[PDB]
Amino acid sequence: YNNTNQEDLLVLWGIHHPNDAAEQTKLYQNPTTYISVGTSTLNQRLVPRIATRSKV
Amino acid sequence: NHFEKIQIIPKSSWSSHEASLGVSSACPYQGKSSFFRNVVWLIKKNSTYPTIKRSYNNTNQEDLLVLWGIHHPNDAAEQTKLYQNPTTYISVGTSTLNQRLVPRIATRSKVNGQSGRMEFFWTILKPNDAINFESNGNFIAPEYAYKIVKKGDSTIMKSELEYGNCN
Ligand SMILES: *[C@@H]1O[C@H](CO)[C@@H](O[C@@H]2O[C@H](CO)[C@@H](O)[C@H](O)[C@H]2NC(C)=O)[C@H](O)[C@H]1NC(C)=O
Ligand SMILES: *[C@@H]1O[C@H](CO)[C@@H](O)[C@H](O)[C@H]1NC(C)=O
């Protein structure tokens, strides 16, 4: 997306950290994933993180 | 103002990993070279290191200070020598924690004769919550943890002086 507007823009996004490899492939097939995001200033490569956690 | 130390993962309970070989000349007790007493330096048994999947639940009434660590070795040789598995990680989870630690190799100056490094981590595990570890190598597991028995005013004074038997 390009900010063709005149004012600063607050952009939000996210990453899913699943319970286990089963759920990872169940929902996305690909077993080893990442989200990379870039701007004139941002240089992010996010990587989902698996861990066994209490239900919330 | 007061911890009560409890055992939460007994040392004797590690069947498919060597638990008594996690020791170092950098930590002498009295000749016999030793280690941090409250955590275990787990190591490969037979030639191998099965994936560990262990968890403690805080059935107590008070917040619990849990400590654990990761081993960062000198090189791939030592990594496989001690844990066989060449690509490892420790993942730790709570109702709030979502950690995946990865050992980091780098060539470092000896300190207390060791070029490897140990990196410790911690959390406060609320009553009725559990901490779930999973690992594949380089894990330094908890044995003892601390119940926070009482809270109150205190401070960490910095002084070279000693106890004065006074009030
Ligand atoms: C830790 O152990 C206790 C059981 O000893 C669990 O207590 C249950 O937890 C649920 C959900 O938190 C509560 O709503 C219930 O009161 C408890 N159920 C029963 C049958 O006692 C607790 O869930 C465990 N904690 C975790 C994170 O697994
Ligand atoms: C060690 O490894 C071999 C498998 O390669 C196995 O057959 C042997 O019995 C193991 N030893 C013990 C004491 O478990």
From TrEMBL, chain A:
Glycans are attached at residue 2. It is found in: Host apical cell membrane; Virion membrane. It comes from the Viruses. Homotrimer of disulfide-linked HA1-HA2. Binds to sialic acid-containing receptors on the cell surface, bringing about the attachment of the virus particle to the cell. This attachment induces virion internalization of about two third of the virus particles through clathrin-dependent endocytosis and about one third through a clathrin- and caveolin-independent pathway. Plays a major role in the determination of host range restriction and virulence. Class I viral fusion protein. Belongs to the influenza viruses hemagglutinin family. This is Hemagglutinin. The gene is HA. The chain holds residues 180 to 235 of 565 of the full protein.
